[PDB]
Symmetry: C3
Subunit: 89 residues, 3 copies
C-alpha cells in the first residue's frame, strides 16, 4: 500500500540529504586544498624572488669587488713604478 | 491523500534538479580553478627557466670576460717588459 | 494511479544513483588532479633547490678560484722580483 511508498520517500530523503552534506564537506575538502596549494605557490614565488634577488645582489657585489681590486692594483703598481723611478734618481 | 504525496514528488524533483545544477556549476568553478592554477604553475616554470638561463648566461659572460682580461693583462705586461728591455739596449 | 507514482520513484532512484556515482568519479578526477599538481610543485621545488644549490656551489668555486689566482700571482710576482734583484748582484 501507500505505507511502503512513504517509507521509500523517507529513505530517498535520507539518502538525498546524505549525498548533499557529503558533497558539501568534500567541496570543503577541495577548497581548503585550493587554499593550501595557492599558499604553497605563493611561498614558492617568494622563495624564487628572494633567490633571484640575493643572487643578483651577490653578482653585483662580486662585480664591484673585481672592479675595486683592478683599480687598486693598477694604481699601486703605477705608484711603486714611480717610486722605483725616483729611487733611481 | 495521494495529492500531498504528489506534491512531495514535485518538490523532491525540484530540490534534486537544484542540487544537480548547483553541483555542476560548482564543478565548473573547480575546473576553471584547476585551469588557472595550472597556467599559474606553467608561467612560474617559464619564469624559473628564464631566470636560470639568464643567470647562467651572465655567469658565462663574466667568466669569459675575466679570462679575456687576464689574457690581455698578461700579454701587454710581457709586451711592455720587452719594450723596456729593448729600450735599455 | 499509484503505478505512475511508483515509476516516478524508480526513475528518481535511478537519477539519484546516477548523480551519486557521477559526483564520486568526478571527485576522483579532482583528487587525482590534486595529487598530480602537488607532485608538480614538489618536483618544481626540488628543481629550484637544485638550481640554487649548484649556482651557489659555482659561485663558491669561482670565488676560491679568484682567490687562488690572486695569491699565486702575488707570490710569483714577488718571487721573480727577488730573482731579478739577486741577478743584479
Amino acid at each position: 500500500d501507500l505505507k511502503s511508498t512513504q517509507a521509500a520517500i523517507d529513505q530517498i530523503n535520507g539518502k538525498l540529504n546524505r549525498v548533499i552534506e557529503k558533497t558539501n564537506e568534500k567541496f570543503h575538502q577541495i577548497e581548503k586544498e585550493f587554499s593550501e596549494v595557492e599558499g604553497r605557490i605563493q611561498d614558492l614565488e617568494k622563495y624564487v624572488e628572494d633567490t633571484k634577488i640575493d643572487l643578483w645582489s651577490y653578482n653585483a657585489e662580486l662585480l664591484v669587488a673585481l672592479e675595486n681590486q683592478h683599480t687598486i692594483d693598477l694604481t699601486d703598481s703605477e705608484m711603486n713604478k714611480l717610486f722605483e723611478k725616483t729611487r733611481r734618481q
